[PDB]
Design a protein around this motif. Structure first.
Motif, mmCIF file in Angstrom:
data_model
loop_
_atom_site.group_PDB
_atom_site.id
_atom_site.type_symbol
_atom_site.label_atom_id
_atom_site.label_comp_id
_atom_site.label_asym_id
_atom_site.label_seq_id
_atom_site.Cartn_x
_atom_site.Cartn_y
_atom_site.Cartn_z
ATOM 1 N N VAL A 1 -6.227 -5.830 -1.813
ATOM 2 C CA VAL A 1 -5.691 -5.028 -2.900
ATOM 3 C C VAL A 1 -4.192 -4.794 -2.749
ATOM 4 N N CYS A 2 -3.704 -4.612 -1.525
ATOM 5 C CA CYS A 2 -2.287 -4.349 -1.308
ATOM 6 C C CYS A 2 -1.901 -4.860 0.068
ATOM 7 N N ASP A 3 -0.606 -5.107 0.247
ATOM 8 C CA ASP A 3 -0.054 -5.537 1.523
ATOM 9 C C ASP A 3 0.594 -4.354 2.234
ATOM 10 N N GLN A 4 0.769 -4.484 3.544
ATOM 11 C CA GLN A 4 1.374 -3.402 4.317
ATOM 12 C C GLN A 4 2.362 -3.963 5.323
ATOM 13 N N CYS B 1 0.831 -1.187 0.000
ATOM 14 C CA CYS B 1 0.000 0.000 0.000
ATOM 15 C C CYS B 1 0.877 1.254 0.000
ATOM 16 N N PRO B 2 0.426 2.322 -0.664
ATOM 17 C CA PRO B 2 1.267 3.521 -0.776
ATOM 18 C C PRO B 2 1.633 4.073 0.595
ATOM 19 N N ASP C 1 -7.913 -12.903 7.577
ATOM 20 C CA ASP C 1 -9.073 -12.708 8.441
ATOM 21 C C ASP C 1 -8.773 -11.912 9.704
ATOM 22 N N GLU C 2 -7.560 -11.998 10.243
ATOM 23 C CA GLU C 2 -7.267 -11.266 11.468
ATOM 24 C C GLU C 2 -5.763 -11.207 11.680
ATOM 25 N N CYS C 3 -5.351 -10.241 12.492
ATOM 26 C CA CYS C 3 -4.000 -10.184 13.023
ATOM 27 C C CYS C 3 -4.006 -10.659 14.468
ATOM 28 N N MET D 1 0.072 2.887 14.564
ATOM 29 C CA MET D 1 -1.235 2.212 14.532
ATOM 30 C C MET D 1 -1.850 2.211 15.927
ATOM 31 N N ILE E 1 3.052 4.204 5.929
ATOM 32 C CA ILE E 1 1.924 5.032 5.511
ATOM 33 C C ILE E 1 2.365 6.478 5.706
ATOM 34 N N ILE F 1 0.817 -7.104 7.045
ATOM 35 C CA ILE F 1 -0.637 -7.253 7.051
ATOM 36 C C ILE F 1 -1.077 -7.507 5.613
ATOM 37 N N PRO F 2 -1.587 -8.688 5.286
ATOM 38 C CA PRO F 2 -2.037 -8.939 3.917
ATOM 39 C C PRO F 2 -3.384 -8.285 3.669
ATOM 40 N N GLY F 3 -3.586 -7.855 2.424
ATOM 41 C CA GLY F 3 -4.823 -7.205 2.048
ATOM 42 C C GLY F 3 -5.335 -7.745 0.730
ATOM 43 N N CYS G 1 3.352 1.523 11.144
ATOM 44 C CA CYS G 1 3.243 0.921 9.816
ATOM 45 C C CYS G 1 3.592 1.926 8.729
#
Ligand SMILES: CCC(CC)O[C@@H]1C=C(C(=O)O)C[C@H](N)[C@H]1NC(C)=O
Ligand SMILES: CCC(CC)O[C@@H]1C=C(C(=O)O)C[C@H](N)[C@H]1NC(C)=O
Ligand SMILES: CCC(CC)O[C@@H]1C=C(C(=O)O)C[C@H](N)[C@H]1NC(C)=O
Ligand SMILES: CCC(CC)O[C@@H]1C=C(C(=O)O)C[C@H](N)[C@H]1NC(C)=O
Ligand SMILES: *[C@@H]1O[C@H](CO)[C@@H](O)[C@H](O)[C@H]1NC(C)=O
Ligand SMILES: *[C@@H]1O[C@H](CO)[C@@H](O)[C@H](O)[C@H]1NC(C)=O
Ligand SMILES: *[C@@H]1O[C@H](CO)[C@@H](O)[C@H](O)[C@H]1NC(C)=O
Ligand SMILES: *[C@@H]1O[C@H](CO)[C@@H](O)[C@H](O)[C@H]1NC(C)=O
Ligand SMILES: [Ca+2]
Ligand SMILES: [Ca+2]
Ligand SMILES: [Ca+2]
Ligand SMILES: [Ca+2]
Lengths: 389, 389, 389, 389
Positions: free
Chosen positions: C341-344, C9-10, C47-49, C17, C371, C337-339, C369
């Motif tokens: 659309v994008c990972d972070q 992610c950008p 699904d979760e962290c 966080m 960002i 953190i998987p997403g 994180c």
């Protein structure tokens, strides 16, 4: 889709399921925030059963728990716990503020209902899922109130008994018909309809409901209300058996007259309960509870009959003692567990715990269900209210 | 797919849903780790509602809970609880550190947003599901801050009101438009736009949003911001009714001049709230709250109107007293419960609890929703802060 | 199906966080059973962290919590909490006994791994879902041990760094390749491979992994291990930047020689971490942390670079101070953190809390994180270990 | 659909999974309501494993926890915890009242079973999901009782061992066959069938079950019961190995005679357990536990064999000491973890904790599963009952 009554699982007696006893954990040295409560009941969806009760916005031990004897206040709420979770602060889920309660699952969502407000202008609100979808105002302006046990849903409509009026005189119950929590009609109770508190209701077949209630003014016989959900009619009866189920009550068979004759005594009462066996067509056996004592709320004795309870004066058949006569036993409640193949009805027992008049008050709940051929064991609490800190 | 506004469930008044009162469990002898908090609100997905609030990294009772009066610190976090769970340490879920908060569900995931950082260079971070997807820095370098109630999502985009600048002077709010938590555009608020703190926002139909805010510097009339989500425009107004909704405020109708005339007083204020009835086309009724006292944050009174609040100076119509004037009542917040058939709007009330200036501070939350025809009952806390250990 | 690395992610900086601080609730009068722990980390499924850590079979306050300084014992277990739940006894989930840990989700199930046993013959067991599917015995018979942060799963295989041998000398790490928890191959680390403790690993693109480790014997430069998951090869490097990331360390740039020159000092160290931005092809920016102090585990400072860290001696670019130099700061850990659309990627910070040598020991965890454009704020604990009861 | 036995995951030894030790949290200053219990076991569905045990309607610390030594009372219930949750009041789920227990998942729902009632007329009730579907009355009127470990379900039918009769003499076990909790048939145990308490049962291949039991009257050799689920037959054997597994026991190999010769001693005993490796066709290795002491319930030692245990007198092969001989070790139990690709069997150990005769009694549970090539480590409790408040 919608919940509807199935034939019941085979069974010819009542046997113990489980017991919840939160205040066993409220003694000296304990580390639990237990939830004192009254008027408990159970209601189930196809996914889970839940223990519902009316709390007092307080845990025990704690400084504010002396209000737990009160019937009605701005503190009480309808709350619930997954069935089998003990009744602690972190396990509690609050549904609606209010001081008289019912709930029932229609196959898709929970309907929860409480009465909230002052005695002379209370309002029932009905929550469907997360939204308040229904509202029903007092019609007799004298403590609108409801079942303190589960309502019954058939084919997407739920049926709730409410009453309003003097607790020591004529008070006419009404059947509310709900759809997604909205009150869509009221059914007038005809026949023997001058009382009917705290009804415990079960489906008697695919389309009819039978409610066993408390006449707080006129009779030691319990009122029975039958609902035809297809015709949208309801009629009141008086339970005819010589084995009178309310407390206080005179000696068995001593009320002289027809089935619907009140009898000389009759003041006061207690919420009662029954269970049953049924096919899709008809109920084939009924199971009843009453106190051991004819004058005090103590003990619990189970009975059964294959007679029609609105017409036969035959004594009920003894099953046995579920709670010894030395042990306080207050309300009992009917409930049904729906299943994929068969349904099962049960009786819950409010084993009362109190430090005395206008002092700390709560309970333990014992559950018996229709299964087997003989009663398996009686229940105790082994809680001494004096030990509660 | 995406959340969007539906016509609301039938209702013509405000009636109580429930109340959360964690510090009833924080008295002598109690066994609970309760979470002191301020600026609570509620936001819902189609699956559940949640109570969000700003905590202080501490439970009550406990040695560190004396910081709970603070507005901003490195301790505070946006946290939440399933709606109906009491506010205890084990029930809490932490989302983002920060000291001003909002959250809203777009039909697929939660967007959570807080402002974190020092007063002169704070940063809003927006978390979408589990990832921080958005970041928005202070533009006036004077306490960037947001709604303290839920944002509004329509058709996959969410709308958040932020403000930055002096709390005692001109501070221009902005509308942030987010998509999966990323800030994709800013909407300039035109018109009456020199203030607008702590906005409570609701959809007024399929494509428009209306926000009721707090002018902390200029007027006892509340600012109203309307957002056209299709055009991507927003305009500020001043609430015109003689029934001024902020606290402190002068006597009703005493501000001389046009709707947008500030009035002579106006310094200070409190977050306010409204609810509504709407079709897909238009809002048909609005419901408002204000304090009982015109000078102090005490009591809560509900009102309603079918007039356009930006143009009509007509007094609002009294519904009645939801919290007695002797009882502290601080923030109120709007929220919406989405449904499969209809949506429902509600007002939550922060019933404040405190030991005094720069001492322990928290609240009880009471919820009223649009349903029925008359107010059912007022709420109390029955918590004496002196009893909190 | 399987988890695999996406473009991130950008983001161009590190921003906060959230923070977990359980022992804020372990002061006089508090009602919480908090979990003292060390070597925490975070790992996420779609699904979760979850926050993972190594506990000591004890809660604080409590009589047995004085063992919490220990590295290895028969008491410690790998446990976890949903990310955002505070670290209390009821929120804890026990996965495996053992005293060195890692975990990672492959898109279908969790792999959990710990080392258990005596120092001279310990065994790593790997649990996949609920079953122990893998077992890997000590190969150097001198404290087999692993990352204390998440492993990395790509296309159904997970990659775990283990080491065995003297902590003050040459100890060769190995890459374990797992499939449903079974160790299916070992990858030899070539190149600069004489050390590599407590690696923090992240995917650098679709098929490669980069690990930032601790050389506990030879150098204040951190080892870097790169894994080619397609070729099944791994090579060790020494981080070349003048901005040395371990603690203790000499002055920046003062190690004379090539990138892989150890330097004169180098004994001791601390687990370190990094985060990154990447496309599917390549990593485009890296973010690093180190302590404020060059001699003590205190403070945390963030840096960034677009250089290749195995080849460039350029100083890193300062981002700013995340934890003030007066505040203990021990381990840091990488996680992703998987997403959809994008990972972070993110860095977690173990803000250490202790009463002293061989006394009560635990932490608070702060998460930053990738960002935004600038650091938003530093973190504190406001926990005084003397106040813990 | 239905659960059925698969070939087991590769493994040649027993290695530790995890340990639960709730009363580590029941010392001075602690804040936990821990659940004292006895006769624990584990059973798993494809979705989760659960720790089942028999409680006493009480938490520790607390005034009523002195009854926890009792075998049978109206207080005890079969309760469970998600495997890995510590055994605290809020984590507990109550299933059935009763004082002897078993449970097993058939692929669709849980079957739970307890015996409830007085010693001379107890009743087993079987709960399937949420309903009581089965009831089985005492047949010898002398403490009907069951396994205290999981039952076994194959192809939609579950198999439960019960016994009734004198604990110091001949008591004939029966196999109950259940379908959705209803007892649909009883299988007579032929052969060596005069005893068989507290059986630990595992599938030995696709269609057969093997149970390792306790002969409380006649022999230090353990009875073995084998069930052919296709033929619907069961036969009893005596374990033939010179390595006698019960406690108390004589010296290894000292019982003179054939495999089924009882031996001179044999009074008393303890529940025992085994694990195994199997294909779909046959069991290929068995793993056994017994105490370190031949006279007292202390320590735990693991053994293995590839012989048929009903026919070979060969000594078992030593694996090693899982619990030192100075540490109380009471019951052990078999259980199986089902998997998508392979199944895994395990042994759990009840590490007993008590203040003495007719005083507070509970345990810690350690779990070892079939994996690896050597035992990894022994387990301790580090709980001193004197420290429990
Ligand atoms: C109000 C009359 C009603 C008679 C059925 O009183 C009930 C009697 C009670 C009782 O007899 O124990 C307790 C109920 N909480 C109470 N219900 C309400 C609504 O107050
Ligand atoms: C900073 C100005 C703002 C005026 C709306 O102050 C608010 C007033 C408050 C109040 O009037 O009670 C409490 C809020 N926590 C505070 N917000 C922040 C971000 O500090
Ligand atoms: C055993 C050598 C290893 C050096 C990386 O020690 C680590 C140092 C630690 C530290 O420096 O704080 C704490 C770790 N718990 C410990 N790991 C184990 C397995 O004991
Ligand atoms: C009743 C005989 C049976 C022998 C297997 O006693 C068991 C012995 C026990 C033991 O030896 O520790 C504890 C069991 N709780 C008990 N079972 C019941 C049902 O009371
Ligand atoms: C249920 O019972 C009522 C009362 O006897 C009867 O009138 C009705 O037909 C029954 N319903 C069905 C579906 O058989
Ligand atoms: C919503 O209301 C606004 C303001 O009156 C109006 O301009 C708009 O057309 C409305 N939207 C719809 C979908 O009717
Ligand atoms: C990932 O990076 C490595 C190292 O530069 C490179 O060899 C590999 O081809 C890259 N993978 C992809 C899929 O681009
Ligand atoms: C399981 O083992 C039994 C006993 O040896 C044998 O009779 C049976 O055929 C086996 N079942 C299968 C499916 O191989
Ligand atoms: Ca009566
Ligand atoms: Ca104002
Ligand atoms: Ca070093
Ligand atoms: Ca024996």
């Amino acid at each position: 889709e919608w919940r509807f009554p199935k034939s019941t699982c085979p069974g010819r007696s009542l046997q113990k399921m489980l017991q919840l006893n939160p205040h066993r954990h409220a003694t000296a040295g304990s580390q639990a925030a237990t939830i004192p409560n009254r008027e408990p009941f159970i209601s189930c969806s196809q996914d889970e059963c839940r223990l519902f009760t009316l709390d007092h916005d307080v845990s025990t031990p704690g400084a504010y728990d002396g209000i737990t004897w009160e019937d009605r206040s701005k503190r009480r709420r309808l709350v619930s716990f997954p069935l089998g979770s003990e009744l602690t602060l972190d396990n509690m889920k609050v549904h609606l503020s209010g001081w008289s309660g019912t709930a029932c699952h229609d196959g898709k969502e929970w309907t929860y209902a409480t009465v909230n407000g002052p005695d002379n202008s209370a309002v029932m609100r009905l929550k469907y899922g997360d939204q308040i979808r229904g509202s029903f105002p007092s019609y007799a302006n004298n403590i609108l109130r409801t079942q303190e046990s589960e309502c019954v849903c058939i084919d997407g409509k739920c049926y709730i008994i409410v009453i309003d009026g003097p607790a020591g005189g004529t008070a006419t119950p009404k059947v509310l018909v709900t759809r997604e929590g909205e009150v869509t009609s009221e059914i007038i109770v005809t026949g023997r309809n001058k009382m009917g508190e705290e009804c415990s209701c079960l489906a008697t077949n695919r389309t009819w409901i039978e409610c066993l209630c408390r006449d707080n003014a006129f009779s030691a016989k319990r009122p029975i209300i039958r609902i035809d959900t297809v015709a949208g009619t309801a009629r009141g009866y008086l339970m005819c058996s010589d084995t009178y189920l309310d407390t206080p009550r005179p000696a068995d068979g001593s009320i002289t007259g027809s089935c619907e004759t009140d009898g000389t005594s009759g003041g006061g009462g207690v919420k009662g309960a029954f269970a049953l066996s049924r096919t899709t067509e008809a109920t084939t056996e009924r199971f009843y509870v009453r106190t051991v004592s004819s004058s005090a709320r103590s003990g619990a004795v189970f009975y059964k009959t294959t007679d029609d309870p609105t017409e036969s004066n035959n004594p009920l058949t003894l099953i046995g003692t579920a709670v010894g006569g030395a042990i306080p036993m207050w309300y009992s409640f009917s409930f049904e567990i729906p299943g994929k193949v068969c349904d099962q009805t049960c009786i819950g027992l409010e084993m009362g715990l109190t430090m005395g008049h206008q002092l700390w008050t709560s309970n333990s709940v014992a559950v018996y269900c229709v299964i087997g051929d003989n009663l398996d064991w009686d229940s105790t609490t082994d809680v001494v209210p004096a030990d509660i800190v």
